[PDB]
């Protein structure tokens, strides 16, 4: 469960290293955001001269979480960090070639782009 003051590892190469959540973009007050959820964030650290700067308020999408996701098939998946990929306002990934796994949830949500670049969809 990602939430407001939470830090996310940056999964693409937008030249951001970390954003902390800021708001989760479910309903008018969702308590948490999970895999496949787009949140507003703040870049807290960012590689020298990337596309994205420290302090840029951005949209991104939770590709990996530390709290296990249940699948209707009765199984579950969990990753050793929380991670998102910064995406466009129209919703396309701002970077290219994202890395580290990803949840199939991403697919069913309309994020094929990222999963295509995803080196391994779990």
């Amino acid at each position: 469960m990602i939430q407001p003051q939470t830090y996310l590892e940056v999964a693409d190469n937008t030249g951001a290293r970390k954003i902390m959540c800021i708001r989760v973009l479910k309903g008018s007050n969702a308590k948490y955001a999970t895999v496949g959820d787009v949140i507003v964030a703040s870049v807290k650290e960012a590689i020298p001269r990337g596309a994205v700067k420290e302090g840029d308020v951005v949209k991104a999408v939770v590709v990996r979480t530390k709290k296990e996701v249940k699948r209707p098939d009765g199984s579950a998946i969990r990753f050793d960090d929380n991670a998102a990929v910064i995406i466009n306002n129209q919703l396309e990934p701002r970077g290219t070639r994202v890395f580290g796994p990803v949840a199939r949830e991403l697919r069913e949500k309309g994020f094929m782009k990222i999963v295509s670049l995803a080196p391994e969809v779990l």
Binding site: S75, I77, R78, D80, P101, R107, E120, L122
Partner: protein
């Protein structure tokens, strides 16, 4: 009625018996039924089993591996119509039932900690390659 539980147990015909015994603390490849776009591949998953969680039916287990520098654990229903077959693939001296402790070691020290269960290896390659012949003739 004094059955009570026996009745829950009747509710179970869903029992599968094909998948092998595997102790925690030794790697397994589980071939899982996956919904891709709208088809059904069999994604594999090959890690150390970290936690079997006995409850008869709906007993379950988890396996943990590092997919691309990122760790992953998957929780599996031991009798899931979605497991194709679970290939055992290495027997290890666990020394302790639930072993999440391995989460903060993840490296070579794991290896120095999870030696090979020489006993149970001997058992398998034996009564396996040894029951191969009992099938023939």
């Amino acid at each position: 009625m004094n059955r009570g539980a026996l009745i829950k147990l009747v509710e179970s015909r869903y029992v599968r018996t094909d998948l092998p015994e595997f102790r925690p603390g030794d790697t397994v490849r589980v071939s899982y039924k996956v919904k891709e776009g709208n088809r059904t591949r069999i994604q594999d998953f090959e890690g150390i089993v970290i936690r079997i969680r006995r409850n008869g039916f709906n007993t379950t287990f988890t396996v943990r591996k590092v997919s691309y520098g990122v760790g992953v654990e998957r929780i599996f229903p031991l009798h899931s119509p979605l497991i194709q077959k679970i290939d055992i693939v290495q027997r290890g001296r666990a020394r302790r039932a639930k072993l999440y402790f391995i989460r903060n070691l993840s490296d070579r020290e794991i290896r120095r900690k999870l030696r090979a269960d020489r006993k149970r290896i001997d058992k398998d390659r034996a009564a396996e390659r040894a029951a191969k012949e009992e099938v023939q003739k």
